[PDB]
Ligand binder design. Structure first.
Ligand SMILES: [Fe+3]
Length: 267
């Protein structure tokens, strides 16, 4: 599979100027979506923050006194309506929701138990949520007039950090792939060929179209299908809108309110 270099070629988006640098990157991001099926940006300094977060997650996975499995999803307070945050034992991973970061109460306990990882995760979540909301604005701008705003939900969005890891797409609105520890993540282009983005040890983030956005754009934007082919740690933000909100679609240029919710879409 051919390597796809992105350092130096993708638009540069600086941590202390996210909103403005994304505006300037709009045209380039649009052409990525049209020409590749996924989007990319270089965020100087993101790589060291993500690597520190991932390395500390890896240490937490082996910690025993207070284990990470003390915060398995089935023993963590969950929202009445919503997804499932907490730890997922074994290939083993955690979902850090925006609700969890705000302790919505006891749900934040995994972060108080491992505050070094948890501080980094909250930091990366906030950067990633700002970035992915602006990627969402770019995609919206490519859609017909009258397209509602994506309205990504802070509390429902979650950051997944994976330890120890087939063709798949993501179910949510948008995914933000953060620089993984190792090469291996691959994407299919519009022509059906596979490329392997160079993102390990880099400041490059990838933005995925998820199946919810495919649905809301009635097919205009295909899901960013990808796979992982190893020879290890990775993290990605999954952004969804409010679970209880009604679905919508832009069919042939007209806004189209459905009776099912975004939470129904997942199930
Ligand atoms: Fe994925």
């Amino acid at each position: 599979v051919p390597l796809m270099e992105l350092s130096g070629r993708a638009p540069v988006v600086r941590l202390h100027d996210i909103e403005a640098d994304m505006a300037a990157a709009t045209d380039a991001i649009r052409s990525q979506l049209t020409g590749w099926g996924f989007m990319a940006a270089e965020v100087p300094g993101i790589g060291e923050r993500v690597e520190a977060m991932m390395n500390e997650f890896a240490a937490a996975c082996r910690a025993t006194g207070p284990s990470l499995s003390d915060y398995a999803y089935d023993v963590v307070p969950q929202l009445a309506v919503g997804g499932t945050h907490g730890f997922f034992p074994y290939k083993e991973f955690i979902h850090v929701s925006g609700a969890m970061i705000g302790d919505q109460p006891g749900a934040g306990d995994v972060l108080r138990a491992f505050p070094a990882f948890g501080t980094r995760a909250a930091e990366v979540f906030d950067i990633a949520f700002r970035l992915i909301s602006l990627f969402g604005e770019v995609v919206r701008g490519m859609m017909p007039p009258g397209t509602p705003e994506l309205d990504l939900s802070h509390d429902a969005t979650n950051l997944r950090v994976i330890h120890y890891r087939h063709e798949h797409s993501e179910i949510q609105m948008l995914g933000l792939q953060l620089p993984p520890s190792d090469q291996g993540l691959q994407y299919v282009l519009h022509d059906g060929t596979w490329v392997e983005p160079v993102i390990a040890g880099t400041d490059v983030v990838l933005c995925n179209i998820g199946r919810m956005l495919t649905s809301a754009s009635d097919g205009r934007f295909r899901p960013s299908t990808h796979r992982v082919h190893t020879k290890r740690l990775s993290s990605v933000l999954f952004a969804y809108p409010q679970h209880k909100a009604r679905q919508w679609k832009m069919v042939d240029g007209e806004l189209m309110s459905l009776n099912a919710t975004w939470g129904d879409f997942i199930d």
